[PDB]
Design a protein around this ligand. Structure first.
Ligand code: CA
Ligand code: CA
Ligand code: CA
Ligand code: PT
Ligand code: ZN
Ligand code: ZN
Length: 168
């Protein structure tokens, strides 16, 4: 696994998130579920905990955007870059942006929202890309036969625990 340079990490264990807007691709329920599950994957193996905010500024602001959307890194239309997220810190740091020129799915027929969110949240928490191909943090989007037995790899667990420790 890899962390970001200087090992930027959150310096509190309780983090807030907010879902700023919703893709037309999916029911709102399936967006909330995918995000909740992606946060849970990391919560399970650390002492971090998350709560949703419906107004004000949360640590991890989550949104769907296309092309120019408010930062210096425009999205690129269908395929290729699916989403991007910033390392831990104030303001835009921590935030995760999802390219709505992708077709977001609950399953693996388009681009799976849970899997890409779990990966991007890994960045929001301080993990950079892994060299390990089995790792959630490996760069490459991997459709893969069966999301149902999804497991974070030991590599992902090792990286995130190197930052925040194991559950208490
Ligand atoms: Ca933020
Ligand atoms: Ca794209
Ligand atoms: Ca879309
Ligand atoms: Pt915000
Ligand atoms: Zn962005
Ligand atoms: Zn990545």
């Amino acid at each position: 696994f890899r962390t970001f340079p200087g090992i930027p990490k959150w310096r509190k264990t309780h983090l807030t998130y907010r879902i700023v807007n919703y893709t037309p691709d999916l029911p709102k329920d399936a967006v909330d579920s995918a995000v909740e599950k992606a946060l849970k994957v990391w919560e399970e193996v650390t002492p971090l905990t998350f709560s949703r905010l419906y107004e004000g500024e949360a640590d991890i602001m989550i949104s769907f955007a296309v092309r120019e959307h408010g930062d210096f890194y425009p999205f690129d239309g269908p395929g290729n870059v699916l989403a991007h997220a910033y390392a831990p810190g104030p303001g835009i740091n921590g935030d995760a942006h999802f390219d709505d020129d992708e077709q977001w799915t609950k399953d693996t027929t388009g681009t799976n929202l849970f899997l890409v969110a779990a990966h991007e949240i890994g960045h929001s928490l301080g993990l950079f890309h892994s060299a390990n191909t089995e790792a959630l943090m490996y760069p490459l989007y991997h459709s893969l036969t069966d999301l149902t037995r999804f497991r974070l790899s030991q590599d992902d667990i090792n990286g995130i625990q190197s930052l925040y420790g194991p559950p208490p």
